[PDB]
Structures are given as C-alpha cells and as structure tokens.
Amino acid sequence: ARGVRKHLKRLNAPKHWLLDKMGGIWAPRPTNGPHGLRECIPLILILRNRLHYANTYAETSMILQDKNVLIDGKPRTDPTFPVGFMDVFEIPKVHKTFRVLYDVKGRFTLVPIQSNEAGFKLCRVQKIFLGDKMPYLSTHDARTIRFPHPDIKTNDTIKINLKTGKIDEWYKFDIGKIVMVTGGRNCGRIGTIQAIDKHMGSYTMIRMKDTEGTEFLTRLCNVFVIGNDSPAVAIPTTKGIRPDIIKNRELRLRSIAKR
Amino acid sequence: KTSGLYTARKLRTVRRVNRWADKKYRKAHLGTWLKANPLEGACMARGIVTQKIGISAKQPNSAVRKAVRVQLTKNSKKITAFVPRDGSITYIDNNDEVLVAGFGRAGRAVGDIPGCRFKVIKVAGIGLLALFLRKR
Amino acid sequence: RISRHRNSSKTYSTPKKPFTKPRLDAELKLCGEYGLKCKREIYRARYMLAKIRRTARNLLTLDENDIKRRFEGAALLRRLHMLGILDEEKDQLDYVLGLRIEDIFKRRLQSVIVESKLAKSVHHARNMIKARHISVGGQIVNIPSYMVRISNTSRVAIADTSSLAPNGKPGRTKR
Amino acid sequence: GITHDKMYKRSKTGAVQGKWHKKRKYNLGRQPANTKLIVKISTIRCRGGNIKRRALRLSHGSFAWGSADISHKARILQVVYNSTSNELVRTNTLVKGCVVQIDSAPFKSALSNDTLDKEILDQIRGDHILARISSRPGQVGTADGYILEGPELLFYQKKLAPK
Amino acid sequence: MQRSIIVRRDYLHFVQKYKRYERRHKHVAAHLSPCFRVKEGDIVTIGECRPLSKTIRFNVIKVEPVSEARFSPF
RNA sequence: GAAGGGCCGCGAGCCCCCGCGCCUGGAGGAAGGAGAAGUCGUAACAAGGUAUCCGUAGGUGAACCUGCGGAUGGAUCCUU
RNA sequence: CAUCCGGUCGAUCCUGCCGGAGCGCGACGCUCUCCCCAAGGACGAAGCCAUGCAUGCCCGCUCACCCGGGACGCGGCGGACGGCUCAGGACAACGGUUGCACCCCCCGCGGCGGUCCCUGCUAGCCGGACACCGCUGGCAACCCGGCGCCAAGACGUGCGCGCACGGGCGCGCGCCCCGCGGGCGAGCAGCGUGACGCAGCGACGGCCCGCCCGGGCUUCCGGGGCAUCACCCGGUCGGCGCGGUCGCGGCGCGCCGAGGGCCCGACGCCUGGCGGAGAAUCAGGGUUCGACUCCGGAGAGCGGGCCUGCGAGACGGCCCGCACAUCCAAGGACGGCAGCAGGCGCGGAACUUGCCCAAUGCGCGGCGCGCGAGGCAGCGACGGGGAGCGCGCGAGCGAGGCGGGCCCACAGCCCCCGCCGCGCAGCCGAGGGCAAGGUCUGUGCCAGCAGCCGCGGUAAUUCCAGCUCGGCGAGCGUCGCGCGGCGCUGCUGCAGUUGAAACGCCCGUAGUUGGCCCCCCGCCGCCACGAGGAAACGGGAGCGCUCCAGGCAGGCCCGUUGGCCC
C-alpha cells in the first residue's frame, strides 16, 4: 500500500489485548521496538486500561512523559511503547513492581514482584550472528550481546543483569526444563519439556508435561525456557495448571457468590 | 446415474447443462430476460402515456379493461399498463407522467387482460389508490 | 461509525401458516388470560421457548456427562431455574421439554403482581406498571413484561411514592 | 519505463495475460550502461537509497595471476571475444566474462621468474596478457579481472586464432 | 527440453456436494541435471529451487526407474 | 556545466489497414402469437362416411390429395 | 428447527406445471402516541462538478511588530498511513500452506563504534550564502525579475588507530557419501592472504549490524460461464552467456536448440466479475448473493512518463498526449469531489452547502496544536427493540407543557426532580385456497373484481356503498429479487413401455468402471488425533442496560472477569 501502515483498526488488533468492539474505530498501534505487534501489549493498555491509572490517552501521555514509567530500567515516554514477555514493569511513585508474564487464559497478566525480583529480565536466544568479524546473540526484546560464552547453543535462556547490560545466568534448553509458552493454543502455561522432535526440514515440535499431568505439544519457538529444575521467576498464582471448562465455570460461579 | 468415486466432474457438468432445462432457471439466470424486460430489474419505472386505450377482456369475462400506452423513459420502450380500480382512467390524461409496476406474475399476464404485463401505480406523481379513495 | 459495529436481531418467529384457526383461537385465550397487547408478544415467547427446547433436544442426544453436556446443561437448567420458567424440583435436562408459552408468561411480572394479589386483573396490572406504581427491590419499572426472577419474586411490591403513605396527590387527588 | 514485471509476458500455454495493475516503481529496470573502454563512474540511487556505482568509461582494472600469486593494476589495451555480441567487441564495451588484453608492463618483472608455467610467461613479453573481466562495471563500478589460465586460455586462444 | 523435464502430478480433488473425488493433473517443469538418466514414465523427486527459468522452479533430486512400460498418485 | 543537437530506450496520441464483440436505421419480403368475431370448405375424432399415423417424393385456394416402404398407437391377440 | 393446500373432469387416479402459504431486502402507496438502537447516491452514470473545507506540526536559526512569546523565512519530520470507490483484472486478484542458501526497509528498540596515505589543513572549532528581508521592479491575471545585508543541527569542506576499511576482484574443503561447528536438513558464514578502490562521517560526530514492522517475489492446493470456441502459443518452451533489478527469473538482449499447453476442455470469447472472512434462506445434503462495515487486491476523467523519497511509477506531486472544461487585459494562465457536505445528470431509489477535536487513534513536541480520520447533533416507518390508546368503580397516569438538576467540547437527548397537566389506529380483507356476512342498497357480462380457480347477462356469499365481522397492528398493503416451497434439477433423491425423454444399428479411442486371489511392507488415497493459523460474526460461560434489542460489563471480587468452540 505504498508504504508502512501507521494506523490500526480496533477489530484488527490482537485478542490477548482484549479491546472493546466499540468506544473507537481505532486501537493503539504499538510503535516498533523491543517487542513485535502480534506478541506485545502497548503501554497505554497497561496504564489506562488495566491498572486504570489514567482516564484518557492525553492523561496517559502526561504521566508517561514525566519519567515515572520504568520499563527495563529505561524512562520510556511514549504511550504505545511495546511491552513483552518477562519485561519488568516498575512504577516507582506508586511503589508497585511487576513483570509482564503470560497468563493461563493466554493473555498477558502483570505479575507483582519485589525489588530483589526486579532488576533481572529473563531472555531467549533466537540466533547467533557473526556480523562485523563479532559473535552476537538474539533475544525476543531485540537485545543484542557481543562475545557469548561458546557453551550457549540455541533456544537457550539468558538473564540480563540490566545494570551492565550483560547476561547473568544461562539455562541449557533440553528435556527437563520448566518452560512457559509464549504463543499458540497452549499459552501462559508453565510445565516441563518431555520431548523435542527435530522433524528435519522445518517446525521442531516439543511436547511438554504440566505439573498436574496435562500433556500439551507446541512449536519450539512458542516455548520460552523459564528456569532449569526450578521456576527461577515468580509463577503467576495458577502456575499454568490450566482449568477444564467446567472448573472455569465453577471458579466464576464461586467468585460471583462471594461478591 | 453416474456412480464412481472419481465421477464428480461428470456429475457437476450434467447439473450445469441440465439446470437450464427448467424454464424458471432460464428466465432468472440466462440474462435474456434482463435485457428484454421493459423494467430492467427495476421494481417499477416512470413513463409518459401516449394513448389511453381499453383492452377487451379474454373469454369468458366481457369488459373493456382500461389501459394506457406508456413510453418508459429509461429504455424508450412503449408498453401497455392496466389502470386499476373503478373509473380511475379519468385521472390519467395523455402526455402525463405515470409510474408503471408489475402485475405480480413476474412479467406474465393476470386473468382476462390479454397481453397486459403491468399496472399503473402513480399518475402525475400521486398514487392511483389514493385518488380513487379521494385521499388526495 | 462504530455504530455499524452494534448487532441487532429479530426476537420473534411468525407462524408458517397464517390462518390456522385452531391456533388463532388458542392464541386468543392466551392474550385475554395474560393481557398481551399483540400476537407478536405471543410469538416472542414461542421463539424463546423454541430455542431453549432446541438446545435441550441437542443436549439430550449428546451422551450423558459428555463434558460439553455437563457444561451446557448446567447453564441451561440453572438459568431457567433462576428465571423460574422451570420449577426447581425437576433439575434434569429431560424435563425442559414440556415447557409452554404460559411458563414464560408466568414470570412476566404482569402475572407475578396478579399472583401475589397485588393486582386484581392482568389488564389492571399492565395499567399499573405503565404508571410507575410497581417495584421490584424498590425499582420503579415501566415494563409490563419485566420477566421477574425467583429470588426477586418476594421484593415485588407497590412503589415507595405511589400508594402507601406517599405524596398521594398528583393525578386525581391533586384536583 | 523499462520494467522487469511478469504481467506483460504470456502464460506458459502462450495465453495472453490480462493487466491487473499499472506499472510499479518497485518493478523497474534501468537503461543498460554499456561500459565503453577509452583507447566516468556515475552514481545512481537504488531502492533503499543504496547507491550503486555505474562505470560508463573505465581505463584500467586490478587484473591478477593466481597461480603465480601476483596481482597488479594494469591498463586495458583492447577488448577481444565478447561471447554474446560481436558488436560489443568492436565497440570495446566492458561486461563480465569479457576477454581483454591488459598491458604486460606491471606483470613484466615476472618474465625473469620461471616455473609459473611457460605459456603465461610468453604472454609477458608481447604486451598482450589475455584477461577476463570479473566484475559487472554497471553494478559494482569496477573492472577488476583475472588472467586466463590453463585450458580456458587454450580455448580462448583457439577462438582468437588468426583463421 | 535441454537438461529439463516436465513432471506430471496426478492427484484426486474432492468435490464436496457429490461425495466423490475428481482425478486431476498438474504439470511441473523441473531441471534434470546430466548426472541422473531419465526416460519418460519414470518416478522422479523434484525439490524447490530459486526460480531457474520462467517455468522451472524445481530441480530433480532422485530418479526411481520403472519397468520398460495409468494414474498413479505419488 | 545551462539552452540546445544527435542516437537509442520507454511510450501516449493520431493516421491507415485488419480482426473481434456489441448495438442499431431500414423500402420490401416472410413468419408467429393474442381480440369477439368474419369469409371458404370440412381435414381429424364414432370403420368420422377413402382406418389413422410415420418417413420420403410430387401436386393443389385451404384444410389437404396421391405414389412407395413401414407401424398399430386399428376396426384383426382367432381358423389346411 | 424432516408439514403442504387451491386449479385440467361429468366424476376419478396420475404426470405436470400454474397459483398460494413462510422468511429475508429494497422501492411505492396509505398511515405513524412516545422512547432506545441502527442502514442510509452501490445497483450495465469509476457521468460531470459551482462553492466551502478535508495536513499539518515544529523551533535547529531568531537584530521588524510584541518580549521571552518570537512572526516571516530557511531547516526538520510527516504528508506513501488514513478517508473514498469497485472501473479494470478469470491459472490474475483472493484464500489456506511454503520458501528467500535470490532479496529491500523509515521509525523505534538493542548492540557496535579504531577511518589509509600524502600535499595543503584551522580543529578553542572552517568557509561562502540562500531565503525571509532593505531597496528597485514588471505582469490583466497567473507568475516572479534584479541589487545589496545576513543565521543555522541548512550547504560544501574537513584533521582523525597502515586489526586503516565500503562495494566489488583473486587464491584459499574434499577421494564414495554421511556421521562436529559461528553455524545449518543442506559448502553456509566469517576470516587469512593477496591486490584494487579511497567508499564512510567528523564543524552539537556517527557509519554499520541485529530485531521489529512493512514490503517485493515465491512453493503447493483451492480459484466463473460459453464447444453456436478444438486445437493453441511463437519470448511462446528449454539451454547458454551477458545486462538490468532490491534481488530472482525471457525480465531484457544476443546466441543455440524445438519445445511448451491441451476433450482431467487447452486456447478463444464473454461477463449487469473485486476476492476472502462472510450474508440470506434454512431437517439433512444444499441453493443463492459475495457493492459496502474487517482483511488482502486495484484505481483516482482516460492513457503514458517521471521526480522527491526509506518507501509513490503518488494524482487534495509534476510533465505530456487525449477527452471535457475555466479566467482573460487576447499575450497568456489553470483544472481534476471513486474525501466530507452540496449541486447537476441519471434512475424505482439513497441525508446537513451543521458543530467540533472533548473521546478514539494518527501525525508533529514532552508539558498542545492539527485532522470532513472520527465524535456530536440534524434528516431518516432500511430495519431491529421496548412501551401506549386505559384501568377500575375507585384511584390514577404518559403524551405533553414549564423551571431546576444532570448530561454534553457546547448545546440538546435520555434520565431525575418539583409544578400543572390536553389518549389517540391504521391498512388489507369476509365464495374457495385462507380467518371472517348466506346483511341491505346500487349496478345488470356494464362498471369493475380476481396471484389462482373464478365473480358480474335483474333474488351478485366476489363489484359499489352502508352495516356488522375477521387478520395483523403503529404498522399494514403493493411491486421487484433471493431462498424455502421443489424429490420441478434429484450426491442424498427425479424421470425416460404409453404422461416429456433410450441414440436405427455395430465397431471403437479418451473417459468412467472392473471376478476371485498372498494375513504382516513400500508408496498411496482413506481415517483418527496433533500442532499452527486475524478479529468481527455465528454458537456459547458469567453479568438485571428498568425489561429488551444490547454491551462487555461489573463488584470490594479465579492473578474479579471478558472463558471456550468455529
């Protein structure tokens, strides 16, 4: 269409975002950045529509321009900033610290953390590139790191210190790793890998066993290592056990009675 | 009939060729009717009445059904349309705008009016029914 | 316009044959008994019952305890039980079949006020609701076909500002 | 308006295709810059704004002798054997794969050297060492090539043979 | 053609209204490198490649020769 | 390095010539269908007063008539 | 969400249509007591357009007016998105599925940052100069001429790590292959070493690499009719070398072959052809429509060509031919509503030449402007929803009216108040289908009615009135269309002795179809379940918008929701 599409329609927006059909013909277009539009939530949704700090966009802009927002140690002044998996969302004036993890409904739920919990962002190695004569690695948030420990292979786990912009810890992707799923039918689910099938050609399919017993199979890329034999991050209360439809009705029915 | 797991093409071809055999499908989907219809796909059309004429009733009924010879403006095709209701031909005058709509038989003729495919509905921009009831 | 986005739907189904007299007579009885202004109100409840019974027909074919059977059976029986269209004793997918236009009409609130003696006649009851003199949980309702629920049956009562020591002046008394 | 679209072409069955869109700028082609050889490198702005160098007239290039590992700039004396059009040989146009006579003077010292073959050392005396251009001057803006070595030479000597 | 073959693909397409399939055919142009030897009527494997001609986007990987002399879905 | 000038490239438009699809004006000819009924016979239906009918050929105001080979849907399930 | 009924006869049983009966979506008639929602110049005119308006923002630089605000200018960023329409286009678009070891990309985000000599350089730091402007101007207009003053994060230069460094150019694995990587299913990358070239960018240093998003092509499958179109093509089909491109490829050009496509329908022709998600109708299997709401395509009167660009073959850019215009002072200039309003033409048909950025997003700016995107009203019986025209013998309303709140960008609307208080039905019908007069007049095969069968020729169940009565109801009738009816298109599931229809016969190629037969696998088709795939919609969980059509709300709350299915 002669160039990039700046606007984005409300109907043509991801379902993990949860826009309302009405209220606008437009939904926020996430400006290019650490996370991709399909797999990121703009900050305006997490600020005026989920923590409900601001009423409108204009309000959100003022409290974003003021350096109060803190994503990954950076001031961040734009409302449609992309936020993504394992991105620390710290709000300091309100003194609440959270990390944006996925949820068992498949949407992204802000997971409350401590000051000690904040300061580290877990990352996934996508590719190792030898450009400019130095080895670099690829993370989902577009972070690029020169001279990796040669032991790190692929689809591995990184933990940026976020203070020196260097990896702190590395988990090797193999059978036996607590993992959360960042895409697909199986999403926001923490369980541990049972098999990684190569399928020479394309699309490696890994099968993973949840704690309770649910076995679910998804693509390799959809996986995101969360730890080794321990979660290594705060697990959202449900620890991605994943409810049956009837149990979900009963959770809603019990909740309604209490209110 | 053709009965093979691999005979879908023949069965599709037979339906395509045989479907046109029913007269109503041919009227609806050939496209010859759309060119021919004095009202081309329209519910109705406006025209000027050149002559007020009466068409003798087909047997066994005996009557001078009152009709108008109207030249439809959209196609410049002259046509015959019945003026409905009792003594309502009086409202029609030659050289007067009229709106002509179908007789409900989809281009066919109804009852004893021979070769009349339409009825006037509005004369001089006023509905014929309203004039007969003296509403206007 | 996001106005285009708003969904609208017909809520009633008309009869396949318009002049079946046995039915036309049976309908007249329902209208006179339930004070229904038009046959459309009789058809709207027929449509509501049809869907409700079509769903329980589909559900009954599904094998017992078929996960979706358990999930959708509850939301049918339990929402009907709240509405009160079904008496709570039955509580099984077999007896949703056997409901009638009268069962829906029974909870209309025109009937509920006549049933508890608040309104002498359905014709009087419709007149009462349109003058804002009936309340459910102290809600001044202007709707004759409110479709009141089992729990909200007890709350149905005369309005605070209409007859029991209220202003009691605007209207005939004020003159 | 030169274009590299497939819309203008016929189908594999020879059926005329119908034109759905008007010419696009992304599907564009440019007038060939036949590189004349003197006996200027133009800059053009491509897609992405990348600038490709187009040599229009280029005097000399970095030719090379791989077996003897000696590579020096040399002057392009004359062009022989285009292999696509005889017209290009007599207009001295410079394309990749174009046999050319480079001046033997930069490589003159190796004449004293020996054991780097014998046929190639005979060419050193004449002023005519055969060399195929290896770089598309229209796209890369340079005419760097390689001296013909071994059987390729014998084929290109037989082609150039006085008959 | 010169170092190129046309591979006939035979497959069944299922028309939904008639609960029946249709035998259907598509012809794929492939590059037959001089290494393998191909005579007409022989099964070959063709792999996708950068377009190498207007019609050739596939290159023969293997030839399974058949006997000296139907519709076969491969 | 401007105006310009040349050779090619891309290519509008026009000008012929050609093909294609459509849409139309026709003196005059020839149908068909509808009106209520006129004129001339009576061809078919009762063996309809020459059983009809089919193919084909010819001839007549008109239905039609006639030859030649069929058919029975005929008026014959039947007679060394 | 498995239904029929009226009509050939003197009757009958059929075939078979005709007609009804249902549901949409638009036009027309007549009529609309109030509120809530909501479609709205698409329909062989992608015809033409008066006028108004739809893209600005910014301060890098600031010696007219006003103060810290700068106007104008130059500079930057955007104007390629959005809004609009469906003309073109039928192995095309478009859908699902692959690839790019054949690729381009602004922003943002994360890395990374060494910049050759040598002459002349200033690196506490370079020029000269343009616009605005001062002067002096022509021109009907449009348009702009000179001469001087003078700034930038503008312009051009430019010192700077000979592990200096862009592009491209050489030589750098194999011993039958495959069994490690910086890596890969893949010999790909990177580097070393030759030589070329001096690419960056440096006057508020940043190239470059990545990721993202958005492309460009691409693989497989699906992707209209017409045989009164049967053969077709001739860069057409392959090879090879060059060129061109962002790259790939007959993409272009030589050269060299002779292919390539087709009754499994090629090619030709035609379309009142944008496709999909979907919409209508609706046991099932289906039929029909795919203007428009989201997604992808295409286009800006009709063709071409370009420039600027990171991206446009851009038209609220330019240039040219064409077609139709406009103003003229007669020499010139200048259009482009398939943006939102509005007119004209056309048609059966389709709204205001409002108000506004307050929301929602986007552009620019970090402390706010701009937007006919939108929002808000106005018009609006496309439609959808919910209430009225009384109840009861006594009370009352709501429709109003008028003030106040509240609401709203501002009104208003709803709603809440006090205060008075004005209820009101149409449109089709009563012989049958098909519910409801064997009433009384007029009229006498007239007038008219009647989808259909039939009524009317003097005791008219059918016309014209009155009278009653039915049906639906603020709507009802009519006309056109699609579906159902319809098993009258038949895969399920039609019929062919006589109702319509077995070719006069026989051979026969494609096509279609093939006896029985091996338990054990290889490839099929097949079937089961996987992943992975936009929402809207549809189905569906919860939730009293007063009910409701709705909407995702809400309540001190599963990580309160907003599940799940397609």
Author numbering:
A (entry chain SE): 2 to 134, 136 to 261
B (entry chain SO): 3 to 138
C (entry chain SK): 2 to 176
D (entry chain SI): 2 to 40, 51 to 174
E (entry chain SM): 78 to 146, 150 to 154
Paper lines:
Giardia intestinalis is a protozoan parasite that causes diarrhea in humans. The highly compact and uniquely GC-rich Giardia ribosomes possess eukaryotic rRNAs and ribosomal proteins, but retain some bacterial features. Using single-particle cryo-electron microscopy, we have determined high-resolution structures of six naturally populated translocation intermediates, from ribosomes isolated directly from actively growing Giardia cells. The translocation intermediates, with naturally bound tRNAs and eukaryotic elongation factor 2 (eEF2), display characteristic ribosomal intersubunit rotation and small subunit’s head swiveling—universal for translocation.
Structure B is a hitherto unknown eEF2-bound chimeric hybrid-like intermediate, where eEF2 is in the GDP state with a distinct density for the leaving Pi held by the catalytic H143 from Sw-II. The SSU body in B is slightly rotated: 1.05° compared to state C, but corresponding to a back-rotation of 8.9° from the D states. However, the SSU head is still highly swiveled: 17.5° compared to state C, and 13.3° on an orthogonal rotation axis compared to the D states. eEF2 domain IV is inserted between the SSU A and P sites (∼10 Å from the P site). We observe clear density for the P*/E tRNA. However, there is no density corresponding to the A/P tRNA similar to previous studies, which indicates lower stability of the A/P tRNA during the dynamic state of translocation by eEF2. We found a clear density of GDP in the G domain of eEF2, which is coordinated by interactions from P-loop (G1), G4 and G5 motifs, similar to other reported EF-G/eEF2 structures. A distinct density of the ‘leaving Pi’ group can be seen in the path of the expected trajectory for Pi release held by the interaction with H143. One interesting observation is that the Pi moiety in this structure is placed 4.7 Å away from the phosphate of the recently reported GDP + Pi cryo-EM structure of E. coli ribosome. This indicates that we have trapped a mimic of the post-GTP hydrolysis eEF2 intermediate on the ribosome closer to the completion of Pi release. In our structure, domain IV of eEF2 is extensively stabilized through interactions with the SSU head and H69 of 25S rRNA, in the absence of A/P tRNA. We conclude that post-GTP hydrolysis, SSU body back-rotation pulls down domain III of EF-2 via uS12, which in turn pulls back Sw-II with the catalytic His, thereby guiding the Pi release.
